[PDB]
Design a protein around this ligand. Structure first.
Ligand SMILES: CC1(C)CCC(C)(C)c2cc(C(=O)Nc3ccc(C(=O)O)cc3)ccc21
Lengths: 235, 10
């Protein structure tokens, strides 16, 4: 029930405090398979899976700061986090896209080009993920918009096996209303911005469905096992 | 069991 301005600031702060921006980071690169496409580069996969584990921890920290999220049953908090895991991780890595070099930057500064993202584990998802990063760029979204989009993605009453889906639908409504007033207030000259941002949630769900298929094939390909926190989210 | 998740959430 908070006022729109209060909800926006809470969500903006939840995202900013769990997501360093590309400008804040000390970018660095690696020579590992930078110019050769391979099925799986194990050194990149080891680094990528470690950074993904860290991003999951930051995603849970973000969710716990969203108003009313911790009031849902623990079973529903878990169902929501599992279902939105890939959506939020993909939105986050795509937020750090540099188009001139066609790279994405991780939360420690590691900057990978398209071939290296392919080799790290993206595989067949690579072009869809980079296409999404390119669609996001002209929107010029800020921390409040990215945080609200992540929150709308997470607090979704249509996820399978929710105990209280109508409660989740009710919690999402104020987030959608807040994004609408914020986007219009911030940029009144662009009246089509809000529906364009909502369409990114649909694109993202399609990519995350393909991502769940990729987890299956990667499980057969990696030499060891998936890290425990990744397994909890995706299996 | 979602052991780690339970820990992060509680
Ligand atoms: C489906 C596939 C290929 C396999 C399963 C895992 C490894 C979970 C994965 C992870 C991501 C992902 O985006 N990870 C991110 C890692 C770190 C940051 C950051 O530092 O900001 C952001 C995102 C995408 C796809 C997949």
């Amino acid at each position: 029930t908070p006022e729109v301005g209060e909800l926006i600031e809470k969500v903006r702060k939840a995202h900013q405090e769990t997501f360093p921006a590309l400008c804040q980071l000390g970018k660095y690169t690696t020579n590992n398979s930078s110019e050769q496409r391979v099925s799986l580069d194990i050194d990149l996969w080891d680094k990528f899976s470690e950074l993904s584990t860290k991003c999951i921890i930051k995603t849970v920290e973000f969710a716990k700061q969203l108003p009313g999220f911790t009031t849902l049953t623990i079973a529903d908090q878990i169902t929501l986090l599992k279902a939105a895991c890939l959506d939020i991780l993909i939105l986050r890595i795509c937020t750090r896209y540099t188009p001139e070099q066609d790279t994405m930057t991780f939360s420690d500064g590691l900057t990978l080009n398209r071939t290296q993202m392919h080799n790290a584990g993206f595989g067949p998802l690579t072009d869809l993920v980079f296409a999404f990063a390119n669609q996001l760029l002209p929107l010029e979204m800020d921390d409040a918009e990215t945080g609200l989009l992540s929150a709308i993605c997470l607090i979704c009453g249509d996820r399978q096996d929710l105990e209280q889906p109508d409660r989740v639908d009710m919690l999402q409504e104020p987030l959608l209303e807040a994004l609408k007033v914020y986007v219009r207030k911030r940029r009144p000259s662009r009246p089509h911005m809000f529906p364009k941002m909502l369409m990114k949630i649909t694109d993202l769900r399609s990519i995350s469905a393909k991502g769940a298929e990729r987890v299956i094939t990667l499980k057969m390909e990696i030499p060891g096992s998936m890290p425990p926190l990744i397994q909890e989210m995706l299996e | 069991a979602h052991l780690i998740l339970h820990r992060l959430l509680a």
